[PDB]
Amino acid sequence: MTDRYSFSLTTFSPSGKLGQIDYALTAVKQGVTSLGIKATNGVVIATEKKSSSPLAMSETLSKVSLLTPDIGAVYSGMGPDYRVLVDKSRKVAHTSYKRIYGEYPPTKLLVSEVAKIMQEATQSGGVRPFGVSLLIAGHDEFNGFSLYQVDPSGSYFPWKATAIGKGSVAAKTFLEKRWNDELELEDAIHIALLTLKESVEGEFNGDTIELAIIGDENPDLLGYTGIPTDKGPRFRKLTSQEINDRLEAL
Amino acid sequence: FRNNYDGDTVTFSPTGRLFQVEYALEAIKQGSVTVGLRSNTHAVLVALKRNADELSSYQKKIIKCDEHMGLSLAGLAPDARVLSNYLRQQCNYSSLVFNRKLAVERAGHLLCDKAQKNTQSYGGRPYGVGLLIIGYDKSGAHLLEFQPSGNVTELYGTAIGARSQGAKTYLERTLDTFIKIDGNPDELIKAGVEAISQSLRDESLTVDNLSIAIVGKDTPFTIYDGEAVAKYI
């Protein structure tokens, strides 16, 4: 008969490549269009939120979470698939690093540990890997700014500008269309708004659009003063009221 | 039936009765036949011993469990061994903790719960051996009929095995006879010999194939063989 839809849990794919990954990438393609732009002085990520019912509160859905103050993340796919992954991903960064080195996890170690959970889901039978794709953007002292595309197959690669979701193929050219590596962060946000606007024309406001940036530390989000050594959070989530300010200036 | 419903013990049927249990009962039909009956003061079990060929010796189907109790095993051989050690452990557990011999009504509840756990669990092979258990306790003589499904029913006497209808017909007309006989263990054994005789097709009429065990308020459970059971024959 046809294939049994194996992750290589108990069975290797006879076709030479796993067929359900493309069906898991179909669940990735099922997700909203989410993009990111890696520049020299900062990294910006943009994504759209599903409206669903008109009475659903838009502030409840957060498609950009906080792992470490210097590293942001954005995802496209099923809702509960991202929560179970990150709830376990946080405990990995705490025990394997923060309970040992007692600092904030860098960009190289944190992204690698997130992909290891997907590797265990593919290896351990009976547990289906989650079909969400995560775009992790962060800034550390060692490697600096970084933008990585985490695939459900367990592979990650750096990208200057990349997109996931239904517009993964379409917006990838659109990001390369208006943006180049020589551009800075300020001109990158305007490009991210123009590219994400082409995804849906219904509502471009901050209610259904969640925009976040990575950049210079903000002392207002540090929560304390008096210590010059400890750096402030490099990730600042843009309020929906502030998102409309960038729309009028777009 | 092939696959479809009732292919697994967990799998049900459109009617709702699992046929896998009936398949385990089929082994009891052509297995070793046994006949038994009890009175208020006495209990009697007559079991037929089987063999492979003339050179093969007859094996006793009655297995000792408690001093005041007894049972006969007709069904699958390996399934009957585990239930035997289970009842042997409960009799010693009741004597070690409660100091009292295992009750007949209590033995049936523990035996029913024992075979039920493997039935509701996925995998494994349920017990298909029939058990006729007699015993003498403070409540008196009792005879339990254990079906492969685990059903427990109290009767004056019954029979399982090859041509079990021959003894059942005898027990229906004589039902008012052996129940009124008290203090006469010889008359109850003679009724058991005439009961199995109508059931048997006269394969082997010799003495060595019949094993008669009796228990009462005076004489405990004892298995007789050879010239001991040849007096009634």
């Binding site: - | 049900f12 996925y122 685990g150």
Partner: protein, 243 residues
């Protein structure tokens, strides 16, 4: 289809066929009824006589929970006793920690999670029996019947088995007899008559009437079996009405 070969799988109809087959398997069993009065509850079970070899007061299916709750089911006999024997440990487990007998709505939650989880487990076969339990706890008389599908609610009367269709029509008449409900002794004579009316399909075989009840009036919150003149009065009362 193949939905019946794998347990705990959503069917196109919304309920597993094995769960549906377990409900239909209850109708193949004996008819067991019940009546919930103001001062207590009354249970009545019908037992088909296989042959004259049966000894009375032996095969009785009445099950006990603590001293204040009676229990009876309809379905496979070996499958029902395992559910009762586990409920006996659940009532004892609550008695160990809280040092008090278990109330009826609490007894249904322990057996509820016990059966409903097995319907969610593939390695465990769901129950094909319907259990009827009730009594008088500190909160008063309560009656609950546990369906093989896992759903249960408070019932002013209980009907199941093959003769549940003829029994349900008689249980609804209890409002017509009296607006406040029959007494403890009047319910025993009333529950017995329903057994004879539900016996029209079973008339090809004999029967043995078995009735048990627990109330605060006579038994003072104790589970006892109906015997003496009370058992013979309920028999002769129904035989004159069926004329």
């Amino acid at each position: 289809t193949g939905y019946d070969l794998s347990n705990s799988v959503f069917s196109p109809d919304g309920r597993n066929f094995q769960v549906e087959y377990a409900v239909k398997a209850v109708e193949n069993g004996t008819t067991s009824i019940g009546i919930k009065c103001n001062d207590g509850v009354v249970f009545a079970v019908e037992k088909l006589i296989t042959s004259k070899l049966l000894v009375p007061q032996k095969n009785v299916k009445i099950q006990v929970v603590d001293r204040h709750i009676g229990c009876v089911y309809s379905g496979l006999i070996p499958d029902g006793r395992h559910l009762v024997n586990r409920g006996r440990e659940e009532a004892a487990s609550f008695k160990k920690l809280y040092k008090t007998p278990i109330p009826i709505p609490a007894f249904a939650d322990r057996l509820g999670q016990y059966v409903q989880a097995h319907t969610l487990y593939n390695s465990v076969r769901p129950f094909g029996v319907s259990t009827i339990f009730g009594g008088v706890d500190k909160n008063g008389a309560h009656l609950y019947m546990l369906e093989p599908s896992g759903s249960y609610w408070g019932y002013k009367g209980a009907a199941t088995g093959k003769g549940r269709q003829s029994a349900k029509a008689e249980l609804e008449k209890l409002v017509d007899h009296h607006p406040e409900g029959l007494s403890a002794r009047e319910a025993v004579k009333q529950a017995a008559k329903i057994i004879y009316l539900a016996h029209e399909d079973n008339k090809e075989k004999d029967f043995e009437l078995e009735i048990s009840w627990c109330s605060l009036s006579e038994t003072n919150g104790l589970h006892k079996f109906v015997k003496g003149d009370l058992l013979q009065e309920a028999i002769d009362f129904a035989q004159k009405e069926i004329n």
